[model samples]
Target chain A: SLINTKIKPFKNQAFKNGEFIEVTEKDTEGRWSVFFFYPADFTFVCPTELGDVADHYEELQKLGVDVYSVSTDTHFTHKAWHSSSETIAKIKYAMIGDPTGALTRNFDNMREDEGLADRATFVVDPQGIIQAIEVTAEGIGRDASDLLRKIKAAQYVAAHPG
Target chain B: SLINTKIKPFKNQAFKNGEFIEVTEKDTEGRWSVFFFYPADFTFVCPTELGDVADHYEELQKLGVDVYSVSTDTHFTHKAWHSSSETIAKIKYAMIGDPTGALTRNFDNMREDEGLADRATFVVDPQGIIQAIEVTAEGIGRDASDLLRKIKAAQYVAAHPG
Candidate 1:
């Protein structure tokens, strides 16, 4: 978990595809990263966004970046949604679930009443500093391709460092 | 106000500034509209997005679209934010306040505990039916320019009927 700060929780605090893996901070490997968080699994809009991101996963990887899509849903629920939902089934990126909302709260996207994350996306540099962030209402589904574009621009800035 | 929905209440709705009153479903003349719901009057990231849309307001207007921005804050607060916040100051569009949360709930962006809208943006066709909706968490601010792009695309599809 992250300390009392705005930084996202350390990687590997949750499960990814039925495996308890820690996305260690050191795992960043000097590359840029995008942490895309949504409210829940098996919900409308979320899958469209996930699938969109999945559609562009290869392009993102080619840029020497790792993408982690996170949510407040548990890993099991994530898997269930992934298995049952056709839209989610298309996702090829890492899907992390924060059942306790700890990670969600760390990112300041947790909605206590709904016990869900507030559809948040963060782009973190290898140094772990948030470079760009995007949040949307639950009703608005996002396009991962657009996110990829933003990440590319961010990466450009990071490399240029004006 | 919306019916048959689960959300909170917002009272004290009005806007007064630049001799332009707040435009609503009742006042608008266009066949379609874009209403953007933000978190507060003066804050980070919000003004950037607002300014982005405001920059494109003229283009949107030419397309027979009226845009209104709603918040859980009051109209007076909106004016203050618009005037005091440099980013928001650039906004030529209307800034609506839903201090009571009524309008916010109608759009499905109200967060009960926070008493703020969750950055919900909507596209309403002439029939007043919501054609497109987006709700993002507060931390991950939205890009209004992208929103305008979506509106253009939505309008294209809506008008062509293909």
Candidate 2:
């Protein structure tokens, strides 16, 4: 819904490779980034999507983009999932906690009735403007390879602005 | 710092007893509640404070009060801490994750520079008005016994208003 709009202000915590870290609007400043939102942690479909992202994270990073996956679940929950699931364990990208729904709301992805986030992905350019977005239904899982392809196009367009 | 004001809207994920749950301002409606904010999880001083509150949780519950502890850490982190730390493991009260810092900022306890929260507590009446608050220095951990004493006073004042 916020396509082409600048990213809004927010500060959050994330879990990455066994460490808890602070994330803020400043983190996305001047860098290509991804804000991935899912419904909840320790539930169905979500882990598969996160794990798929994990598979392509290194490639995403090498492309000079930072990836952040978010959920209504807290950073603690993110850590637990990372430890418990073999797929999630491979994620080196930041897993953000959006319990207050601020970031989810900022991205216009909150399902108020359910008090969770719709499965969505936003790709932002270096200037923090959203360049691409994808929203899916509950049971439909997302693919990281496709996300990577989109990011490649996004990065390409950013570099070669016609 | 937000004493005597209505609590702003927030929805977050929390860890309690071995399960993850959603928490929102609606949950506080018609119930006396406490929002206890701390800096981070898996750190020095924080677990002691959370453990102290855990120690008094039953007594607080008997008074018909729901208590939630918040920090910049994610709920996932809260579960990990609860599972790993003897001190934190005893907590039965909801451990709210404020990764987005919405709740902390609403309470005016966010250390914006550091992206963490100040140690703070707020007691909210059934109608969601914050009636009592306490903020402490980091090294000086909080005492749940004192918090219980203050909640009693708040409840008494609310019940027998002249």
Point out the worst 10-residue segment of candidate 2 chain A by lDDT. Answer: A39-48
Full-model lDDT, candidate 1: 0.65
Could you give me the TM-score of model 1 versus the true structure?
Answer: 0.56
Task: Write one digit per residue (lDDT tens) for candidate 1, span B38-145.
Answer: 777765453666777778878887877777788877777877776787767667767777776777766655667778787667776666656555544334446767
DockQ of every candidate: 0.08, 0.13
Alpha-carbon interface RMSD for all candidates, in angstroms: 9.4, 5.9
Each prediction's TM-score against the native? 0.56, 0.64
Query: What's the CA RMSD for each of the models?
Result: 8.1, 5.4
TM-score of chain A of 2: 0.96
Cα lDDT of model 2 by residue, A90-126, tens digit: 8999999776678888998988655578899999998
**After superposition, which runs of candidate 1 have C-alpha atoms over 4 Å from their true positions?**
A1-8, A11-20, A44-46, B1-55, B62-145, B149-162
- How good is the docking of model 1, by CAPRI class? incorrect
Q: What is candidate 2's DockQ?
A: 0.13
